[PDB]
Design a protein around this ligand. Sequence first.
Ligand SMILES: N[C@@H](CCC(O)O)C(=O)O
Lengths: 216, 535
Amino acid sequence: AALPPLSGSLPIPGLSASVRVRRDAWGIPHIKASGEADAYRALGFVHSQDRLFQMELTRRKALGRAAEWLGAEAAEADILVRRLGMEKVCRRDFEALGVEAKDMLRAYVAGVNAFLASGAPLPVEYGLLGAEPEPWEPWHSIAVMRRLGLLMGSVWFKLWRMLALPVVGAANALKLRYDDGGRDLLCIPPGAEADRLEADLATLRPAVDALLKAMG
Amino acid sequence: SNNWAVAPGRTATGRPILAGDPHRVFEIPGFYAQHHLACDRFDMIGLTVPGVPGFPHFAHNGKVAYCVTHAFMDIHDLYLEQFAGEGRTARFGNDFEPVAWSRDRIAVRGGADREFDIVETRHGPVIAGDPRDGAALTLRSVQFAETDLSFDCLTRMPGASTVAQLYDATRGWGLIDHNLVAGDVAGSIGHLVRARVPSRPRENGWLPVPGWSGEHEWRGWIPHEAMPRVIDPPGGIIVTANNRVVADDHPDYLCTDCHPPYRAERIMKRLVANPAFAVDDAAAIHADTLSPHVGLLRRRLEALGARDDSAAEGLRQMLVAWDGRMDAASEVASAYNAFRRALTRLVTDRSGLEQAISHPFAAVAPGVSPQGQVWWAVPTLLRDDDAGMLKGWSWDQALSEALSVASQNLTGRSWGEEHRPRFTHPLATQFPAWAGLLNPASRPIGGDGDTVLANGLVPSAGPQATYGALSRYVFDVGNWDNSRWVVFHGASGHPASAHYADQNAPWSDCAMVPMLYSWDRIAAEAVTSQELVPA
Ligand SMILES: N[C@@H](CCC(O)O)C(=O)O
């Protein structure tokens, strides 16, 4: 009774035909639809039955609204995604999309919104927070997807080497990266090896000087 | 993350086998959830992202299986901008141009609203530094800069029937860069770098670069057909594990930073020793715990010679004798970790890098960890004996000091108990009396950031695992019901659910559960069944 009903039948506005959802011995949902739009609608719905709090928390982080749930520790992350323009680039992306992708996204969130209207009890998190879930728009999935991979990869290393510049000097800062074991195993061609290129301080000099000045 | 594919001529089955495991922070509920979705157009099973339709990264559709590791392409550039006009103009070439300024506001639970400025130049938004002072950093990222059509790939991928069709279907994917490794029932295996990467100089990969000179601007996109790919390579083996994808003399600049090759090497080594790879062999490579550093650690500590302090000399003998396995059962593995943490801490303090994050330019949330960065570079500097950052110390002095410090920090716990993640629900610190219910139950696990079993940690914080396989899978391509998978806690996000935390048990053992594809087995095993009906 802290849990949504996972048996019987439940209505979804907008379905053309029934969809069957079987959860196995581990609770994994196997969803069987006729049409593709029904499939996506059912996936929105089933996602929310198991993971509503995750979904909305992840969306709030994407839209710079997580501090409304998490307090001050999420404040600086919210400010950053606002500065990055999450809503603007996700709406932009959505408008450019072909009709099948738009329809998939629309069907998906009509399933999410259907769950919100289904009268399930709310997850324990909403109880704790005194919160009510907010409805979903198609472009929201793009924001959630973007949040998942947000700033992964190279930016951290560049920011880090820049921060090291005035501390250890250029020659040293430019050695601040993950080890290569002495020589990389490459992916392509499989099995091939090669020595990575080290930094060319001579070509980097003007960037380095500019940053020294800027930081000092 | 890890993945591999083995060709039909090297498998026990005579069909492709794909296996691996994505590595992320253990945020709760796990980023990936297991789903099976069928309709008249497709019948697919794999990992979904709650809140996003489709199977962006891990799935098969009964013809092609696919899975990814993060490629470490370079997809984000930082620009040092020169501003004037009290922040209102930024230089481009020899002209200062109007910058976009606007105001925004967030609410904060239990505190006041924060108002702030959003400043944007032709490169992108200012993320660090104050433009009013004349210089700040802007970010131009493939994730934000131009219209992205990745979501069009999601409706095309389900229809692919071969490796090559899958790779066509992903055209235009740019949200994130993946080694997309695939296998099909026709017998092919592939690896594509699925990414949109701008064409621009190697130099941009090292540091924020001048926004005004034009030396550093993006010159269009590396074409789809120029992205690295290989299909049915002659050794019959593909491995990727965040390691450098192509040699740095490749004609497009693609990467400066990636993971060391330890994991790929160890995966590759075990696959090479087994030209009859079976589905059951995946689990043993997942669980691999051999540290790549035992040799270096042993040589150096050996050469260091007996210490005067008694606890420290004991730690030394133990490390010199260690078999280098990060096994859950191993107490000496905890002591190696304690030693490496103390070592990394000392090097970071000594060099002044600990305070590098004092600068206002460091203020990009969530921030960089000096210890968390230096930890990965220590092996290189130690191996090359490069004491350049140790302010007069030699490596032998750092090592000896680290033995002394680390010997006071030995809990004696087996590495499994020392490293056991404390899976922390996002609301556990705000509702500490609920922490017991909210935090899924966790078991002892080995590995560290260097081992194929990649349960890594936060070195500044302690030995506890903070990231690792969110899921493991093996695909038996063309005998699909033999595929297997697991997630680190379970399908449910409801702390009350019987499936909130039940997969943690097989996951902690490096075992997996059936990935069921036949509807007749699914019908036979359904625990609950629900109809979702028109209005
Ligand atoms: N988890 C990764 C796959 C690569 C791993 O994380 O490095 C991802 O999903 O991007």
